[PDB]
């Protein structure tokens, strides 16, 4: 009984471990930190500025005369203005993907779960990951792009044809509100963890496992905020509240893709993002 | 949902 009523949350020492195993595969595991996209977003950096898109002209010069290291799927060059935009970002998102599951595997016991209830985890959580890792990428004037090397302007963004003029402005709304918040990447590597093993996600054979491991990172990353953020308090629920906002985001993302798949043969999503939104929502 | 668990392997 002296066993049973250790009922009491780990160590902190245990956690301040885990907050710093999972930052590290984070570092490894992503190309763009929140402390990069800041240098480059408030100007304190030698590196080379990025190119400010805001209209046709700025656009046309980019595609024409400017070096990215991302681009608009070649094929897809020929299209109409709105879609090789959206189809560049398609293929970033492709990526991301790739980057979000091999970070994932870092999670201390993610491996050790069913690979039923494993792969369903990813399916629902990457975008949410997603939403939340462009965040850093945004401010109220626009969003950076191709790891820096362009910035977009919201305004323009608004200014494409329906329905992709109000694609983005959900996620601006999002994004200035998430910033608001000022998480740093320790923070946001923790966070990034609590999103993918949630006990919420439908058709899970094995939640107590995975709420077992959520409630060991929720405790690891209210410490870390308590630690990290001595000036906000409630930030851990502030924070937790923002889960809603990426849900909305992302439900409202597929029914935009419904569209999408009914209003252009030319927009053709890739077998990932087709599988990935296959029976979602 | 053949592609993602070839990715978690
Ligand atoms: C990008 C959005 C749109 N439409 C957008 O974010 N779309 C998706 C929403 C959810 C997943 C997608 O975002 C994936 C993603 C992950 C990480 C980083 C980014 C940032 N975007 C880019 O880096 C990017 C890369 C290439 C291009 C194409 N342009 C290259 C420059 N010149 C030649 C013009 C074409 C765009 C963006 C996205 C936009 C609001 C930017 C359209």
Redesign the interface.
Same mark, same amino acid.
């Given at each position: 009984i002296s066993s049973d009523i250790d009922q009491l949350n780990p160590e902190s020492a245990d956690l301040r471990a885990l907050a710093k195993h999972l930052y590290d595969s984070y570092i490894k595991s992503f190309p763009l930190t929140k402390a990069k996209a800041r240098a480059i977003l408030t100007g304190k950096t030698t590196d080379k500025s990025p190119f400010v898109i805001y209209d046709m002209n700025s656009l046309m010069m980019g595609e024409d005369k400017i070096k990215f290291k991302h681009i608009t799927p070649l094929q897809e060059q020929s299209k109409e203005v709105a879609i090789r935009i959206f189809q560049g970002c398609q293929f970033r998102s492709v990526e991301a993907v790739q980057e979000i599951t091999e970070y994932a595997k870092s999670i201390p016991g993610f491996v050790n779960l069913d690979l039923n209830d494993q792969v369903t985890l990813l399916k629902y959580g990457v975008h949410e990951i997603i939403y939340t890792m462009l965040a850093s990428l945004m401010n109220k004037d626009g969003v950076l792009i191709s790891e820096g090397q362009g910035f977009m302007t919201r305004e323009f963004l608004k200014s494409l044809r329906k329905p992709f003029g109000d694609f983005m402005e959900p996620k601006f709304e999002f994004a200035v509100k998430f910033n608001a918040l000022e998480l740093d990447d320790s923070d946001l590597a923790i966070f990034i963890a609590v999103i993918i093993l949630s006990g919420d996600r439908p058709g899970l054979l094995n939640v107590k496992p995975i709420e077992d491991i959520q409630d060991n990172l929720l405790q690891a990353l209210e410490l870390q905020l308590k630690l990290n953020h001595p000036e906000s308090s409630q930030l851990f629920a502030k924070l937790l509240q923002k889960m809603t906002d990426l849900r909305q985001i992302v439900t409202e993302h597929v029914q935009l893709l419904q569209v999408i798949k009914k209003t252009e043969t030319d927009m053709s999503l890739h077998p990932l993002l087709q599988e990935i939104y296959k029976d979602l929502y | %949902?053949?592609? @993602? %668990?070839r @990715? @978690?392997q």
């Open positions: - | %949902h053949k592609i @993602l %668990h @990715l @978690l």
